[PDB]
Amino acid sequence: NKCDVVVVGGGISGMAAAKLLHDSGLNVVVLEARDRVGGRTYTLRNQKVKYVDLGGSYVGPTQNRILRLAKELGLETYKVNEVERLIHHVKGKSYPFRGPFPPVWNPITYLDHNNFWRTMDDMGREIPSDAPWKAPLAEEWDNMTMKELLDKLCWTESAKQLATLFVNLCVTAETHEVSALWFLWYVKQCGGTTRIISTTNGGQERKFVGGSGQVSERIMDLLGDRVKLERPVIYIDQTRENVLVETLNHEMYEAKYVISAIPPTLGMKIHFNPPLPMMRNQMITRVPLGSVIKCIVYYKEPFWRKKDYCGTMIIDGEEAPVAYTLDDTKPEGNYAAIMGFILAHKARKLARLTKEERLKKLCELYAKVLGSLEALEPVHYEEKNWCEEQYSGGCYTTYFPPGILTQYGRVLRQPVDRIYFAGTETATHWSGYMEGAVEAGERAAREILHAMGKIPEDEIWQSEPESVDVPAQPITTTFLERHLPSVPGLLRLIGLTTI
Amino acid sequence: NKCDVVVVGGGISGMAAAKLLHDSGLNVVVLEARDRVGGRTYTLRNQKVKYVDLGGSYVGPTQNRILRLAKELGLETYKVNEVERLIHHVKGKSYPFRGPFPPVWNPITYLDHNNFWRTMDDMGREIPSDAPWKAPLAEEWDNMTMKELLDKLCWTESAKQLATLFVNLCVTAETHEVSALWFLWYVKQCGGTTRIISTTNGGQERKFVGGSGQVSERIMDLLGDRVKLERPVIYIDQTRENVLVETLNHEMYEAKYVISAIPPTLGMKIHFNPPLPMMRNQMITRVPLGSVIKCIVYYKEPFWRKKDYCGTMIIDGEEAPVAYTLDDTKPEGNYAAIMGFILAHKARKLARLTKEERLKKLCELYAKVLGSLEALEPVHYEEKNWCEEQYSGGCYTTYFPPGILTQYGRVLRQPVDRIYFAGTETATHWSGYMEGAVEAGERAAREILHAMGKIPEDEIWQSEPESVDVPAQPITTTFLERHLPSVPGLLRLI
Ligand SMILES: *Cc1cc2c(cc1C)nc1c(=O)[nH]c(=O)nc-1n2C[C@H](O)[C@H](O)[C@H](O)COP(=O)(O)OP(=O)(O)OC[C@H]1O[C@@H](n2cnc3c(N)ncnc32)[C@H](O)[C@@H]1O
Ligand SMILES: *Cc1cc2c(cc1C)nc1c(=O)[nH]c(=O)nc-1n2C[C@H](O)[C@H](O)[C@H](O)COP(=O)(O)OP(=O)(O)OC[C@H]1O[C@@H](n2cnc3c(N)ncnc32)[C@H](O)[C@@H]1O
Ligand SMILES: CCCCCCCCCCCC[N+](C)(C)CCCS(=O)(=O)O
Ligand SMILES: c1ccc2oc(-c3ncc[nH]3)cc2c1
Ligand SMILES: c1ccc2oc(-c3ncc[nH]3)cc2c1
Ligand SMILES: O=C1Nc2ccccc2C1=O
Ligand SMILES: O=C1Nc2ccccc2C1=O
């Protein structure tokens, strides 16, 4: 119970921090509230599915830290199926396509859609990844919701509806719930609009064979009995020489430093002595997590592939319970399955139903989208509503409502005496993901090595070599994508020519 | 150890709940985190100020529960001074006035201001006090911020600036931080724009002689050793026959029911077994409290009165640290003082200064606005930054960002097995105030009495006779206020 560092939380970020500190020769303890490690990742194993990721699952190019960590732990990836055509279902009909966005044929609509994605990335380039409150128009952008920004930018309903689906799927929240500054930061710090939304060459390209929960489980194996499960932390006292960390089951740990590797608002579950400084005290009441039910419907065969659909469906409309799906069949071609997300207000609205009722609605939806009666014949179903988790608060990650990132964002990873902050939310590249978890856990561990005098300051932040297994292709645009006007730019050109 | 009901929190709402249950003959225990009672009320006593409310202070007409409770405990009120002129300071100049809003002379700006207040109250009449998510346009109004609503309604910058001040002072938050539905509900459930903003015949009319902390202290006097200080609740377990409530100092209490009388989000500091239901688990991460420093500058005399000013100042503009003040002099004309609030982002901005640096900024601001060098000679200063408080989370109260009240509002006062929810945030009239704390603590206590079969369902919510000491006068409007067109109304006649 005496150690160098207590890590509070045994998700990927606390496990990555604990491993680094252990590898450097320090004595670490990880206090995990649950009876398992992995946190917002959770790999269920049973005979009907073999294994299935019910939390975080996908990785992709440019996520080099999780790929390197997982590789070193003996894990392998495989590519999510994107051989056959994607489907965009809009106004009750399905339109097959290939590429990052469904094709738009109407020239006016085309300009508006082109301008929308272009402008999201243009604004993102004004926003520093490590300091979004330093953007030149940070206040103006943080004081409006994403809804207000789509209202201003989108001169077509078509573009506004697609943009809405994009926000809801990327951050499991509604356009009117989230700040425009924070959402534009969140997309740019993932590499931009194409990279975040893509399967091939993007965030959803791959999964781990056997499930992502193995990352945290295999580090727990390396650490032995240093991971204490069912130890929720209730109290941290920094008034004396060594920090004292108390758990709910009545144990006391003493350490030189602590890393908090839990979602920022879950800091509220810990009583602090002395009290936190004013800005962190209020920050942790201002930063909710989003809302999602991850649902996986199993079938005898991946029947959609025979119709030349890959299983990816972008599904618009209020009545659809799931707005986005991917094929979740095993790489061997068996345990055929569709993964779908029930997003944001729908996660709250449909949580009232039973599991069997949600399975029925999802099969009825997929049968219509795929024009396939076979979708009404599931062989098994698994789901997880992350809104119910006391020790997560939601999924995938924390969002910032209007006005909060500029006022309180500076303190998200600011140390509090001998407490340092990990967790994906404090990352600067793919924050909200497993990648951001590794970045933040290793960065917080190195802050402590630096505090101890073990490494110089310039080693706190460390670049990551690009994976040789999952290389990234650049995201490119065409001259016409770059230079074609927006709708109001065209109207300005028309008004001028009319003169 | 064992009792009928454990009340978590010894603010006014927890105290009022515990007193009601105690008076009905149950065994109650109050578990208070701090080494004091009163919560968001705090009355400091020293020789320089005699006493000063550093937290909640004001009561007024229509707040009959807090007036009845305090009168039963032996307290008296006095009137906040409003005899002389009020000041609106705009663009670096003071304009003295009387009445609920500063006069506007430009005919366009007049229409724009008149329509703004009128439209806030018109909207409020469609929002049920006890279920604002049932307003006919609930979703539409909940999905916009107040800044977006003000941008829509205000055709002049003058109106928009005064509306901004009004939102910042009522709910200690910025217009772009809050939902329009929730803000409109908040004003309506205090009786509308005139009643919430007014001193005479409104929410700021009176203060308690000796301080409002005396309400919580005097109920603690009654309950004696039933109130346990420095007992932060850390864990609530309802998986067994009786509810088990555990504190940080390693004590265990067992009860038939619990009342949670703490700000909603501070339910995060309690680990629940079984876990909370999904909607409350997320709700209590979505409901922050506002930000405010309350500052009281003392002087040898209430010198502003010689100049026919009462000490109320509405001060616009970014550079002013304090946007609103009231005279805090004691009823006897002594301990002269001005109370001012540093609101919302300015509480965040100015909290980095020292106490003496804040005093200097305040005094230079008041010298400009009162047009008196006497404001530069303070004799004493007290202040409290509520943003620092672990066991409040901010002041005055909890605000709802866009989208949260329609999605989660129904859960605020929904019982969770044998836990019932008090706290001013759960009230239906003057929620956010000491009056809403009494209403909610007494109603939560009565839900428990009904669960015990002690009273019928219809006695859970109880009306309150009007105070004889602080009666309400009607809020009226003129024919012109009712019927003058808005700016886009006047343009639909051109
Ligand atoms: C839930 C989810 C997440 C998700 C996703 C789909 C869903 C449904 N899709 C993802 C994807 O495909 N690819 C990806 O990279 N990420 C995706 N996510 C997000 C991902 O799961 C999270 O970003 C990442 O797992 C976060 O890791 P981090 O280590 O930062 O945080 P955590 O997993 O929440 O771990 C925190 C641990 O702390 C324990 N805890 C909480 N409170 C306490 C206290 N008081 N004491 C001790 N331990 C505590 C939690 O139990 C948890 O284990
Ligand atoms: C801070 C403030 C508030 C205020 C105001 C000015 C300021 C600066 N102006 C007011 C005014 O003039 N007139 C008025 O009526 N109200 C005004 N307010 C708000 C008013 O103070 C609040 O509405 C009222 O005091 C709220 O009472 P309530 O009883 O609902 O809430 P509380 O005071 O916060 O008490 C909660 C108690 O719970 C204890 N606590 C917190 N967590 C725990 C745990 N885990 N375990 C045990 N106890 C806990 C708190 O310490 C507190 O005592
Ligand atoms: C005789 C000429 C009359 C034509 C007047 C043109 C009216 C233009 C209003 C269309 C609003 C379009 N959206 C995208 C909703 C908002 C744009 C925001 S921004 O205006 O670009 O800032
Ligand atoms: C809005 C909402 C969901 C979306 O998914 C894609 C996508 N998936 C794979 C390639 N592009 C694009 C897209 C746009
Ligand atoms: C906006 C912001 C603060 C304000 O204070 C008043 C007021 N005080 C007492 C009578 N009216 C009116 C008013 C309007
Ligand atoms: O699982 C997912 N997480 C995501 C984040 C952004 C966009 C798509 C997805 C997924 O499909
Ligand atoms: O203390 C105050 N609380 C208030 C709430 C609304 C309007 C004015 C005030 C005050 O002056």
User: Would you list the domain boundaries of chain B?
Assistant: 1-39+61-76+209-287+401-461, 40-60+77-105+198-208+288-400, 106-197
What residues of B are in contact with residue A385 (Cβ under 8 Å)? 278
CATH superfamily of B1-39+61-76+209-287+401-461: FAD/NAD(P)-binding domain (3.50.50.60)
Dihedral sign, Cα of residue A277, residue A278, residue A284, residue A287:
negative
Question: Coil, strand, or helix at residue B490?
Answer: helix
Looking at the complex, report in whole angstroms how far the Cα of residue A453 sits from the nearest Cα belonging to chain B.
30
What backbone phi and psi angles, to 5 degrees, belong to A475?
-95, 120
Q: Do domains B1-39+61-76+209-287+401-461 and B106-197 have the same CATH topology?
A: no
With an 8 Å Cβ cutoff, are A176 and B403 in contact?
Answer: yes
Asked if A189 and A125 count as a contact pair (C-beta separation under 8 A), the reply is: no
Ligand 7 atom with the smallest distance to the CA of B197 is 7
Cα separation, B281 vs B287, whole angstroms: 12
Strands B50-53 and B77-79: unpaired
Quickly count: other Cβ atoms within 10 Å of residue A428's Cβ. Answer: 18
DSSP letter string over A128-160?
Answer: -TT-GGGSTTHHHHHTSBHHHHHHHH-SSHHHH
Quickly count: other Cβ atoms within 10 Å of residue B239's Cβ. Answer: 9
Ligand 4 neighbour A100 (Cβ under 6 A): yes
Dihedral angle computed from the Cα positions of residues B381, B385, B390 and B396, in that order, rounded to the nearest 10 degrees: 120
CATH class of the domain comprising B106-197:
mainly alpha
What is the DSSP secondary structure assignment for residue B248, as one 8-state letter? T
Cα B102 to Cα A300, B99, B183, distances in angstroms: 74, 7, 22
Find how far residue A264's CA is from the centre of its chain.
15
Cα A42 to Cα A57, A384, B113, distances in angstroms: 9, 10, 56
Place of tokens 């065409």: A478
Of B277, B282, B348, the CB nearest to A407: B348
Residue in chain B lying closest to A403 (CA)? B177
Q: Would you state the CATH architecture of domain A40-60+77-105+198-208+288-400?
A: Alpha-Beta Complex (3.90)
Amino acid at A293: I
> How far does the centroid of ligand 5 lie from the alpha carbon of residue B316, in Å?
11
Find how far residue A332's CA is from the centre of its chain.
27
What backbone phi and psi angles, to 5 degrees, belong to B180?
-65, -45
Q: Per DSSP, what are the bridge partners of residue A327?
A: A338
Which residue has a Cα nearest atom 6 of ligand 4?
A: A197
Cα separation, B401 vs B387, whole angstroms: 18
Tokens describing residue A190? 């993932």
What backbone phi and psi angles, to 5 degrees, belong to B441?
-70, -40
Quickly count: other Cβ atoms within 10 Å of residue A98's Cβ. Answer: 12
Angle between helices A12-23 and A213-223 (to 10 degrees): 30
Asked if A1 and A225 count as a contact pair (C-beta separation under 8 A), the reply is: no
Cα separation, A328 vs A82, whole angstroms: 11
Cα A423 to Cα A15, A282, A484, B389, B419, distances in angstroms: 10, 19, 41, 25, 32
Cα separation, A484 vs A478, whole angstroms: 10
Nearest to A53 by CA among A419, A347, A328, A268: A328
Residue in chain A lying closest to B263 (CA)? A285
E strands in B238-354: 243-247, 252-255, 257-260, 271-273, 292-298, 309-315, 324-327, 337-343
Q: Per DSSP, what are the bridge partners of residue B227?
A: B30
Question: Coil, strand, or helix at residue A310?
Answer: strand
Cβ-based neighbours of B146, under 8 Å, separated by 6 or more: B167, B175, B176, B178, B179, B180, B183
Cα separation, A232 vs A224, whole angstroms: 19
DSSP letter string over A29-49?
Answer: EEE-SSSSSBTT--EE--TTT
Which residue has a Cα nearest atom 53 of ligand 1?
A: A39
Asked if A112 and A154 count as a contact pair (C-beta separation under 8 A), the reply is: yes
Asked if A84 and A305 count as a contact pair (C-beta separation under 8 A), the reply is: yes
A278, A349, A404: which to substitute to probe chain B, counting the most B Cβ within 10 Å? Answer: A278
DSSP letter string over A59-89?
Answer: E-TT-HHHHHHHHHTT--EEEPP-SSEEEEE
Cβ-based neighbours of A382, under 8 Å, separated by 6 or more: A44, A49, A52, A54, A295, A296, A298
What is the DSSP secondary structure assignment for residue A373, as one 8-state letter? G
Find how far residue B101's CA is from the centre of its chain.
21
Looking at the complex, report in whole angstroms how far the Cα of residue A480 sits from the nearest Cα belonging to chain B.
35
Place of tokens 């989003």: A290
Strands B292-298 and B380-385: antiparallel
DSSP letter string over A227-245?
Answer: EETT--EEEEE-SSSSEEE
Ligand 5 neighbour B193 (Cβ under 6 A): no
Cβ-based neighbours of B299, under 8 Å, separated by 6 or more: B336, B337, B338, B374, B375, B377, B378, B379
What backbone phi and psi angles, to 5 degrees, belong to A298?
-100, 145
Nearest to B146 by CA among B184, B106, B108: B184
A·B CB contacts under 8 A:
129
Q: Order of strands, edge to edge, in the sheet holding B271-273?
A: B252-255, B243-247, B233-237, B271-273
